[PDB]
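[job 0412] stage=fold_complex status=start
inputs:
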Amino acid sequence: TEIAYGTLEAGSTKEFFRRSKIAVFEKMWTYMKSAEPSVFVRTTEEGMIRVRKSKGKYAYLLESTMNEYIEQRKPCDTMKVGGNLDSKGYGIATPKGSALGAPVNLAVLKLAEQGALDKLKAKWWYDKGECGSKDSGSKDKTSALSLSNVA
Amino acid sequence: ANLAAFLTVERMVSPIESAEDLSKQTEIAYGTLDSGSTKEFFRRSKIAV
Amino acid sequence: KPCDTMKVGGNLDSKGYGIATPKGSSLGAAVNLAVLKLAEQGALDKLKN
Amino acid sequence: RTYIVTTILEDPYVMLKKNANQFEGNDRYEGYCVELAAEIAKHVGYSYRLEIVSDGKYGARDPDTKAWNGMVGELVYGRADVAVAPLTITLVREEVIDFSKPFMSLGISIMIKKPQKSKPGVFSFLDPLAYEIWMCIVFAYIGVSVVLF
Amino acid sequence: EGYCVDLAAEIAKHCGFKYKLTIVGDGKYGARDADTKIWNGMVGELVYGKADIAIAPLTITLVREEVIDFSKPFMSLGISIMIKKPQKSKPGVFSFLDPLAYEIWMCIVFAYIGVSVVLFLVSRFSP
Ligand SMILES: O=c1[nH]c2cc(C(F)(F)F)c(N3CCOCC3)cc2n(CP(=O)(O)O)c1=O
Ligand SMILES: O=c1[nH]c2cc(C(F)(F)F)c(N3CCOCC3)cc2n(CP(=O)(O)O)c1=O
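[job 0412] stage=fold_complex status=done
writing structure:
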């Protein structure tokens, strides 16, 4: 109950917790709907300010791709934890009754089986970003003791 | 104090965490199935890892 | 059982199982609507849990 | 023939270039969906045109007016041809426009402040008891030495 | 009974049709031989009309799209790493220098030698 958490004030994210049937997410929406003060933000940067000025006392929920992209931006002070809560996915849009939609979907499946989508994912999230190659590091798991007392 | 801290919790951790941990070492081996699209994914991959 | 293994790391590729129908079938679009309805209601995650 | 490709300015999918005023045509933009549409045009072989949406909305159906807006309204009312954008595939959007197979799966995650190993040095030594009881300890030390002498 | 049984029950509930849960004969998922050009398994059952619909974990590929159709994926997944649970392993001699330091013991020994040299320089220089 110490670290508060919230979502965006408008969108299908709040409609996901409002229409949820799981009692865990129902308690989440009950806490966020009865929060004092309001945990909801207007924009993404408002949630960024609410996280960065909290020193670990407030969290924010968002999509995983945007979260990992913000994790791959300076000052490299965010990280994405846990698995995904729902099974969402983006696809190429076309109107109903269009003849090009099936060959476009064939091209999408061709790019997915050839792994070029993962190549563009490595290009535009890992290489383009301003954070070093991480997720772990020079063995940052503190096993024994910090040497600062000894120093 | 630190020896009591070791003898108190005893929370063992895993040595392998990410996918790059497999390429980072060579002592712990790893394998896939002899037939299937899983091995074809590694055979047709273009990522240097 | 014996609860002796664990899974680490995220997913390495984009895989997904879906309902298969023959080409030129009339039921494929209502089956797709039913799959989308079960996905948005979270009943698939309920059966997964 | 022709073909209208629409999107919205979102990072890192659709980004303005550095010399955007020094560029023209479809090469003024860059990112994920730009090279995605380039690969689709490579594997299909058609002429396209990158378009920017006017209202800045993704897609919504006002039930009072019964009218979709955004790129959904562009596809329904024929203002665009193929929409390449990160649009969430829902139940209400399938009945009006078609969709391909999902190329990138995603979900709801948790963002934290990412705490580092912010451990001080000499200040960490005098942590566990106090920074003021030690002075009384040294005072009682010199007092007991006065008692002994 | 299982996951796909209740999934087919939900499909028949939200679509309103009688179903018949049948088992594939050869126990194969689906493949096309390069010689015969014949799909087998439930793929061959759907192509050659032996089946009507397949509710099973069949991997949606491009070569399967060329003969039959697929809906949106209800369950996304990927390739993961299967390792065992890390239990306690016998540490042995490394427990003598396990806690608090891996390199600072040599610093303690160096400070020991330094304090010894300074104490000898103080104690043995009075005349
Ligand atoms: O179709 C939709 N596609 C969306 C795509 C994205 C992304 F691709 F990640 F940019 C986002 N963002 C994630 C949160 O920060 C702002 C941008 C929102 C989307 N929304 C609004 P929702 O109602 O909250 O889902 C849609 O409606
Ligand atoms: O369409 C396919 N669907 C598959 C579905 C599954 C399962 F997960 F059981 F549903 C599996 N297994 C993975 C691990 O458990 C044992 C079998 C293999 C499949 N394969 C073979 P692939 O070529 O290696 O993908 C297919 O071809």
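[job 0412] summary: The first strand of chain A starts at residue 4 and ends at 6.
[job 0412] exit 0
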